[PDB]
Scaffold this active site. Structure first.
Site, PDB file in Angstrom:
ATOM      1  N   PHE A 173       0.798  -1.215   0.000  1.00 17.20           N
ATOM      2  CA  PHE A 173       0.000   0.000   0.000  1.00 17.20           C
ATOM      3  C   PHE A 173       0.835   1.270   0.000  1.00 17.20           C
ATOM      4  O   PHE A 173       0.270   2.359  -0.145  1.00 17.20           O
ATOM      5  CB  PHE A 173      -0.946   0.020   1.210  1.00 17.20           C
ATOM      6  CG  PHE A 173      -0.257   0.310   2.514  1.00 17.20           C
ATOM      7  CD1 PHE A 173       0.408  -0.692   3.197  1.00 17.20           C
ATOM      8  CD2 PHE A 173      -0.282   1.581   3.061  1.00 17.20           C
ATOM      9  CE1 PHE A 173       1.041  -0.431   4.397  1.00 17.20           C
ATOM     10  CE2 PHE A 173       0.349   1.848   4.260  1.00 17.20           C
ATOM     11  CZ  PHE A 173       1.011   0.840   4.928  1.00 17.20           C
ATOM     12  N   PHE A 183       6.252  -2.984   7.715  1.00 18.57           N
ATOM     13  CA  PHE A 183       7.117  -1.992   7.087  1.00 18.57           C
ATOM     14  C   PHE A 183       8.518  -2.565   6.926  1.00 18.57           C
ATOM     15  O   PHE A 183       9.138  -2.977   7.912  1.00 18.57           O
ATOM     16  CB  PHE A 183       7.163  -0.705   7.911  1.00 18.57           C
ATOM     17  CG  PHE A 183       5.845   0.000   8.011  1.00 18.57           C
ATOM     18  CD1 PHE A 183       5.429   0.861   7.010  1.00 18.57           C
ATOM     19  CD2 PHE A 183       5.023  -0.191   9.108  1.00 18.57           C
ATOM     20  CE1 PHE A 183       4.217   1.515   7.101  1.00 18.57           C
ATOM     21  CE2 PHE A 183       3.811   0.461   9.205  1.00 18.57           C
ATOM     22  CZ  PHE A 183       3.407   1.314   8.199  1.00 18.57           C
TER      23      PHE A 183
END
Lengths: 315, 386, 756, 107
Positions: D36, D99
């Site tokens: 994303f 992440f």
């Protein structure tokens, strides 16, 4: 302020002449349909598309003026009279004769810069007794039984212009109070007198010569179902302008002074009335008993007696 | 302002009755209006006398008559063909516009709305058959489709009719989940949305959520997307409320629509080695080989460079093992016919699992891995830096 | 794989419509959705898709459109909206393009040179979703433009090389799929302010060598070529205007000092005579407009041009240079060739193509039409005030962008903010002609009409949005003399929906009727030009208001009086502004107003006019009783008694200011005497004296929402103008009954002065 | 709640402290692997101050435990990243984040 004055009185002072070379090279099929013919077809389709109000169409307003300004000691008067016919045939065989009619019909009686620009094109295309263009227009109107052209003409004639005394004296009082700049459209007392003169010159050229077919088709549109009388509308506008002239003269009674506005606004109405009289003269020029009786049984006698009354004192 | 017309002796000397005849178009339109309203009232009464309760079936149900009338009325509003002369096309357009105006000014759009209302109270042709007969049951679907087509044709082009009956959108979007008329309802709602911007003012979050749920339930339809496109802008002007609603309710989850990504081209290299264990001839069922690296780069263009090593099986006893078909982003471990290792996780069937190791790190330069393989009792094993 | 969709028609069409929806949800200047869409697709997947050759075509076009929409569309539209407004400062760098190379056998290149023109700055925010509480994300997501322009140039060269040989496998299927999106991206890139001079030279050499215009191109391709050439002409027009300003700088510098020098010479060498006054009236009288008009005129053999004859020749040289720079006897050449060549080659469907082609040809042929159109819209300010006018232009662009979107809560808030900023900006006052040249009034009016639409008497939603525009227009018309004339044109429309915003003391200022009054206020010329297509409309509104009370009021809970004293008072105020100007009643307006009022007698209050109530004495007493008794009001509410008193005072003040004159023309005129007699018959004198003699209290303060002392001033003005004071006993009796008590109440002040 | 799984060591000497700005290169992704966000697509590293409450807690508290040149996988919690509302348009409610963060410079 310098650039404002420059753009106001230095650039638009008639510094070009291209309205003939452009249309000349716009008709050459160098290799179908010519480019000018494609343009005329585009304008005709735009005017034929069903809408509720004729749009501005800056393209049409710009090109219908170039196509209009494209047109116009025995050999010197015959060569130009034949070159005028050639210039008119340069664009009236490509559909302009029907395009003007469709543009006038697509306005349903709304005085605007579109009819004011197409009437000048009609003038340029019917300059002189062009019986060929007259017959083309008549055949088109008779083969497409449309009323939206004659009713549009009636609606246009019903709202052309009339000299109003109230606005004239109001502008005079404004000038007396202060040095207010002069209004462009005839001091805002006579609105589009040039448009009125052009409309009536168009109605005159439509019957110029002795075209009895069109002289009778302007009175009774045989073939339709809601025919409208154009002769009676012209008589009504003449009566209106006659009453206006009579009132504007009654204003100038006792005072033996005619100022610049009193001369200009009077000469404008004089020219308008002269054009209406010439149009009626062309309506009844050929011995057409139809228009004879139509003018006999109408309100033309009131107009002419008012004109006699104003003449006997103005002289 | 209405002045009643009383017939009396004296009267007023200002009447001036002027005749005005109507065109054949207007007269025929009025006559077909009367005919269709009579037939539709007959059909409504015949359907209500059966749907209100159990009554004797001596009712007039003009099934075939109303079907033929609908099939004629649908063609009565057929738009002109594009392969037509311009003037004739404009004439037909004006004619159908006048027809639509005369049909709307009699309120029969609400009549066909009442008709489809009274017809939607059932569930299927089988449900309608055992109540109204076999013919009516089998023709209910076709009648509904014809009614929706007529409703769409009545609003196909007019800007007045759509803004007039926009107040009925609360019912259309509700019945949108009928599953036997969703195509017709969607076409009607699309044609009413692409014309009048006033209809977009009453579209709330519930309607957008219902449309998105329809897109999620009935599959990938390319007309729901057109409806959502017409909901964002109508005539050169955008509606930020509907735009935000679409963006926040349609693509946060990513289940719909079709996603996309940019991956790398991976390849594999293998020597001419084959190991087959079974009864009889065996090959010690024990193998071992090392692998080192000279130069590597974690991110060459945009993503982590694929780098795995292991042992891959085959299908039966032939080459071309099964996996990611070919020329994809699948290496070793991305299938049930290969087992690989890349420094951090153990890959088997495109599913990674992290494992502990002294100084567990990605395969940087000058790293020596050793792959061991026993076949029968134990399995493949890897040793990083010994 | 992306390319496998070529065979699968269902997924191809579905993804094409998905890309169309992606572009539609962020079509206009909406960036909250674009910042999401960028991550929803990718940053570099767009570059890969636009560069890939084996695309299904529909997907290629969709990806091109999406790339244009998410980043380039907003700034491209913001820069295209300000494309016909040539604002140019007077910097020393601006005073450098005065040559505009046209002599020594050259014509320059379009878009090459120097701009020095005010254009909206571009700035893009970085798309980041790990950063919490983004500031505003006001403008656009960031995108690398250098890589994009390099790739565009390379792909355009490859595409023209491919099209020159006419193969059978163009990129994306047919040739339109290959050419249209690429030239569209190139066109929007050229619009948004990239392809600096060196790059623009190569972009020109792509088409110009005498290519791309000589190929056999389809209709959607030539349709974009038309827009490309239109921009190539617009930049030349802008360069011409900038050169004109650069030369006009030096010309005015040499003209103003010469005029002042000749003035000093003629003032020093006086030689006072009867013609020196005629010569020197030009300096004091004749404002600069006609001053420069009369000092700049030499096209005939001779006019009254002053002694600076040297500058006349330099102006002639510059005019001839402009003429030879225009088409009047090399871009016009080849444009005019190609335009006619296409139409001669084939008949052209898609009327928009032929329309663009013909407008381009007409522009090339006229040449000076662009100048005569654009020069009114040009402007120059200074080299010092740049940031202020730049902020003003940015706010105006935001106003226009909000106009292009349907009205909502956030939209109304942003529009109110922008209106506040443009009102607070300093250029709003120093350069009032700039706002008129930019059309700020028309923009605000066309925004206000969107809010005022929808309905007529069923909804007045977004009232703050209605009000802010009205107050901005009021200020705009107030600070000028010409802006009043500009708003007088729109005055006709807003009088039709002037019924909104009334019956509520929340907007005593901002209102369409109030903006009409402000436009028609304090100008005899406009007061006269206010003819009668709308006075009868205002009178009919007044009659309807005096016949029907407000349903909103009867809903709030007011005692449902048989008439409405609020909208009537507003109409009376507008009529007062229309009739009375600068202290002298406009005679024609006064006459027509009396005629309309007597023709429609319902406009007068029912207590004064009609077969029922007697007149102003009983009306005012009953109004005072209603104000004192709270049983006839709303249980800050609208005091019905005070409203009735204000309505009657406004009507009497209107009639008084509508009285003929101070007997200058009335002494020798007949219609003035007739109007005075009509007013006298309508309003009795004893009623006026009784209303004057009420002797209001003089109050710990009190509430002034009752019999205000200003109500007496209307009666006093009516008495002075309609009747006058010329009889000794009348003056004495009036002083006794109506003046002494109020004088004592006023003189009895020590400290408690709550009413000045 | 944020957890760190190292991928490449960064010599574990210099750590982010209060009053500094860190330069990172990260490619975020949802729990199911659907990417994303990323900072390598735009080819510009992400610079952010430590302790100024400008990035999400799941990112700042995780970056405050890394070293220069150290690649790590930071797994976050919905409450420490976006809560029960998520990011309107991108992140659905009650979603976990991953992440892939590399530390380029520590200023």
């Amino acid at each position: 302020l310098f650039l404002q004055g420059y753009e106001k009185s230095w650039i638009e002072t008639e510094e070009h002449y291209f309205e003939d070379k452009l249309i000349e090279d716009l008709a050459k099929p160098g290799a179908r349909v010519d480019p000018l013919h494609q343009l005329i077809l585009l304008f005709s389709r735009t005017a034929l598309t069903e809408k509720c109000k004729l749009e501005e169409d800056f393209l049409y307003m710009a090109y219908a003026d170039i196509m209009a300004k494209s047109c116009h000691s025995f050999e010197e008067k015959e060569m130009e009279k034949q070159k005028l016919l050639y210039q008119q045939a340069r664009l009236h065989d490509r559909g302009a004769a029907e395009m003007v009619l469709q543009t006038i019909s697509a306005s349903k009686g709304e005085t605007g810069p579109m009819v004011a620009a197409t009437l000048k094109l009609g003038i340029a295309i019917l300059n002189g007794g062009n019986s060929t263009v007259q017959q083309k227009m008549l055949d088109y109107l008779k083969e497409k039984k449309d009323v939206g052209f004659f009713q549009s003409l009636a609606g246009l004639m019903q709202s052309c212009s009339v000299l109003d005394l109230n606005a004239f004296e109001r502008q005079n009082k404004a000038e007396g109070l202060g040095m207010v700049t002069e209004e462009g459209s005839g001091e805002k007392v006579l609105q589009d007198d040039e448009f009125t003169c052009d409309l009536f010159r168009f109605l005159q050229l439509l019957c110029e010569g002795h075209n009895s077919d069109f002289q009778n088709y302007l009175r009774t549109q045989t073939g339709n179902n809601t025919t409208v009388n154009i002769i009676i509308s012209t008589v009504d506008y003449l009566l209106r302008v006659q009453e206006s002239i009579s009132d504007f003269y009654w204003y100038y009674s006792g005072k033996d002074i005619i100022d610049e506005q009193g001369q200009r606004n009077f000469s404008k109405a004089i020219q308008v009335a002269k054009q209406v009289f010439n149009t009626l003269t062309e309506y009844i020029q050929g011995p057409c008993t139809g228009n004879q009786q139509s003018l006999a049984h109408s309100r033309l006698w009131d107009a002419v007696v008012g004109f006699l009354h104003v003449f006997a004192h103005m002289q | 302002i209405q002045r009643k017309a009383i017939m009396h002796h004296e009267g007023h000397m200002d009447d001036g009755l002027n005749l005005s005849r109507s065109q054949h178009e207007e007269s025929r339109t009025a006559r077909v209006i009367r005919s269709t309203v009579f037939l539709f009232n007959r059909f409504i009464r015949g359907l209500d006398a059966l749907s209100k309760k159990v009554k004797l079936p001596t009712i007039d149900l003009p099934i075939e008559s109303v079907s033929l009338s609908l099939q004629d009325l649908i063609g009565y509003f057929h738009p002109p063909d594009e392969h037509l002369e311009h003037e004739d096309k404009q004439n037909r357009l004006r004619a159908l516009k006048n027809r639509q105006n005369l049909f709307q000014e009699e309120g029969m759009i609400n009549l066909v709305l009442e008709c489809i209302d009274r017809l939607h109270v059932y569930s299927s042709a089988a449900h309608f058959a055992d109540v109204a007969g076999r013919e009516a049951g089998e023709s209910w679907k076709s009648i509904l489709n014809s009614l929706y087509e007529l409703l769409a044709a009545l609003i196909r082009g007019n800007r007045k009719n759509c803004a007039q009956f926009s107040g009925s959108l609360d019912w259309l979007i509700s019945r949108l989940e009928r599953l036997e008329a969703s195509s017709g309802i969607l076409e009607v709602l699309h044609c009413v949305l692409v014309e009048s911007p006033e209809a977009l003012n009453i579209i709330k979050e519930g309607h957008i959520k219902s449309i998105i749920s329809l897109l999620d339930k009935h599959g990938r339809n390319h007309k729901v997307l057109d409806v959502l496109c017409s909901l964002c802008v109508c005539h050169g002007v955008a509606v930020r409320s509907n735009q935000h609603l679409i963006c926040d309710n349609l693509l946060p989850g990513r289940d719909l629509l079709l996603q996309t990504r940019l991956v790398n081209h991976v390849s594999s290299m293998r020597p001419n080695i084959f190991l087959g264990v079974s009864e009889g001839s065996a090959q010690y069922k024990k193998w071992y080989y090392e692998l080192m690296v000279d130069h590597t780069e974690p991110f060459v263009t945009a993503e982590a460079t694929h780098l795995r090593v292991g042992w891959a099986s085959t299908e039966g006893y032939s080459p071309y093992p099964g996996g990611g078909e070919e020329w994809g982003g699948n290496g070793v471990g991305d299938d049930l016919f290969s087992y690989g290792f890349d420094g951090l996780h153990l890959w088997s069937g495109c599913i990674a699992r992290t494992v502990s190791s002294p100084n567990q790190h990605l395969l940087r330069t000058d790293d020596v891995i050793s792959c061991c393989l026993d076949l029968s009792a134990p399995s493949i094993s890897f040793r990083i830096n010994g | 794989d992306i390319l496998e969709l070529t065979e699968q028609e269902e997924l191809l069409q579905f993804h094409y419509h998905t890309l169309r929806l992606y572009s539609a949800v962020c079509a206009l200047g909406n960036h909250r959705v674009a910042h999401a869409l960028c991550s929803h697709v990718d940053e570099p997947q767009l570059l890969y898709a636009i560069e890939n050759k084996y695309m299904p075509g529909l997907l290629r076009a969709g990806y091109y459109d999406l790339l244009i929409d998410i980043h380039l569309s907003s700034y491209a539209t913001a820069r295209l909206m300000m494309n016909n407004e040539f604002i140019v400062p007077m910097t020393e760098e601006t005073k450098s393009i005065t040559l505009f190379p046209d002599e020594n056998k050259k014509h320059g290149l379009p878009g090459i040179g120097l701009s020095t023109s005010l254009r909206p700055r571009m700035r893009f925010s970085s798309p980041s979703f790990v950063s919490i509480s983004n500031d505003c994300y006001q403008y656009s997501p960031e995108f690398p433009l250098d890589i994009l322009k390099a790739k565009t140039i390379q792909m355009l060269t490859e595409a023209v090389k491919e099209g020159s040989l006419h193969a059978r496998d163009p990129v994306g299927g047919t040739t339109e799929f290959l050419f249209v999106p690429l030239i569209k991206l190139f066109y929007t890139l050229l619009i948004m302010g990239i392809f600096h001079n060196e790059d623009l030279k190569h972009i020109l050499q792509l088409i110009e060598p005498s290519g791309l215009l000589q190929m056999k191109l389809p209709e959607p391709v030539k349709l974009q070529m038309c827009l490309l050439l239109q921009y190539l002409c617009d930049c030349q027009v802008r360069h011409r205007i900038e050169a004109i300003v650069a030369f006009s700088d030096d010309f005015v510098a040499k003209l103003q000092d010469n005029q002042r020098f000749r003035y000093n010479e003629v003032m020093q060498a006086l030689n006072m005579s009867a013609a020196l006054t005629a010569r020197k009236t030009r300096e004091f009288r004749s404002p600069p407009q006609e001053q420069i008009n009369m000092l700049l005129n030499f096209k005939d053999d001779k006019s009254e041009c002053p002694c600076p004859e040297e500058i006349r020749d330099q102006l002639l040289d510059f005019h001839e240079d402009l003429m030879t720079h225009c088409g009047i006897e090399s871009l016009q050449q080849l444009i005019s060739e190609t335009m006619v060549r296409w139409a001669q080659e084939s008949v052209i469907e898609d009327p928009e193509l032929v329309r663009a082609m013909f407008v381009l040809l007409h522009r090339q042929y006229d040449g000076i039409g662009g100048l005569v159109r654009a020069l009114p819209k040009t402007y120059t300010i200074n080299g010092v005030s740049v940031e202020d006018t730049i902020n003003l232009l940015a706010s105006l662009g935001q106003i226009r962008s909000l106009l292009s979107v349907r009205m909502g809560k956030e939209e109304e808030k942003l529009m109110i903010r922008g209106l506040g900023d443009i009102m607070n900006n300093k250029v709003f006052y120093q350069h009032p002609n700039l706002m008129r040249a930019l059309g700020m009034h028309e923009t605000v009016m066309e925004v206000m009409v969107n809010v005022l639409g929808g309905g007529e008497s069923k909804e007045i939603t977004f009232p703050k949005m209605v009000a802010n525009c009205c107050r901005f227009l009021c200020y705009f018309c107030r600070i000028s003399r010409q802006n009043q004339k500009a708003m007088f044109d729109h005055l006709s429309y807003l009088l039709e929906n002037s019924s909104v915003g009334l019956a509520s003391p929340a907007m005593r200022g901002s209102t369409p009727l109030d903006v009409a009054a402000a436009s028609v206020m304090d100008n005899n010329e406009l007061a006269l030009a206010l003819r009668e297509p709308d006075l009868e409309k205002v009178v009919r509104y007044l009659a309807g208001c005096g016949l029907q009370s407000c349903q909103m009021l009867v809903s709030k809970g007011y005692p449902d009086i048989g008439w409405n004293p609020v909208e009537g008072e507003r109409y009376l105020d507008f009529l007062r502004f229309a009739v009375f100007c600068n202290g002298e009643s406009v005679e024609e307006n006064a006459n027509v107003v009396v005629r309309l009022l007597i023709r429609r007698p319902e406009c007068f209050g029912p207590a004064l006019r009609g077969e029922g109530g007697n007149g102003l004495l009983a009306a005012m007493e009953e109004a005072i009783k209603i104000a004192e008794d709270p049983s006839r009001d709303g249980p800050d509410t609208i005091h019905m008694g005070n409203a009735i008193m204000t309505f009657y005072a406004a009507l009497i003040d209107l009639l008084g200011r509508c009285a003929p004159e101070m007997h200058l023309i009335h002494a020798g005129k007949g219609e003035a005497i007739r109007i005075r007699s009509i007013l006298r018959s309508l309003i009795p004198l004893g009623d006026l004296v009784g209303v004057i003699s009420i002797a209001f209290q003089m109050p710990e303060p009190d509430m002034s929402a009752g019999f205000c002392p200003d109500h007496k001033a209307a009666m006093v003005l009516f008495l002075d103008r309609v009747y006058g004071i010329e009889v000794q006993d009348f003056l004495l009796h009036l002083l006794e009954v109506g003046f002494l008590p109020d004088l004592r109440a006023a003189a009895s002040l020590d400290t408690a002065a709550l009413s000045x | 709640g944020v957890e760190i799984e190292t991928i490449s060591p960064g010599d574990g000497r210099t750590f982010p402290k209060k009053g500094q700005t860190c330069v990172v290169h990260y490619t975020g992704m949802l729990q199911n692997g659907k990417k994303f966000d990323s900072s390598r697509d735009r080819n510009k590293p992400f610079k952010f101050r430590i302790g100024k409450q400008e990035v999400i807690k799941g990112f700042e508290e995780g970056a405050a435990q890394m070293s220069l040149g150290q690649r790590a996988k930071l797994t976050c919690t919905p409450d420490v990243a976006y809560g029960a509302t998520g990011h309107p348009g991108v992140i659905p409610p009650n979603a976990t984040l991953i992440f892939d963060v590399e530390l380029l410079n520590l200023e």
